[PDB]
């Protein structure tokens, strides 16, 4: 149907859109993830002091 004219696929555009969303959220949780490890280690360290 690449012969009939007009058969472009927005399929890739939606597929590309979904990938973009997943990449953005990846950044979010990663920033969240890095913070919690730091907090726990201080919390554990504070226990040592106590």
């Amino acid at each position: 149907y690449q012969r009939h004219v007009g058969t472009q696929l927005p399929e890739a555009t939606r597929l590309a859109q979904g990938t973009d969303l997943l990449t953005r959220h990846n950044l979010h949780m990663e920033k969240n993830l890095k913070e919690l490890r730091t907090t726990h280690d201080n919390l554990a360290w504070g226990l040592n002091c106590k």
Binding site: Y1, T7, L9, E11, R14, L15
Partner: peptide
């Protein structure tokens, strides 16, 4: 989602 898109495109191609 890829599989969904493939079938989601399978109707319009058959429609013409």
């Amino acid at each position: 989602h890829r599989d969904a898109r493939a079938q989601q495109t399978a109707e319009v191609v058959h429609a013409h």
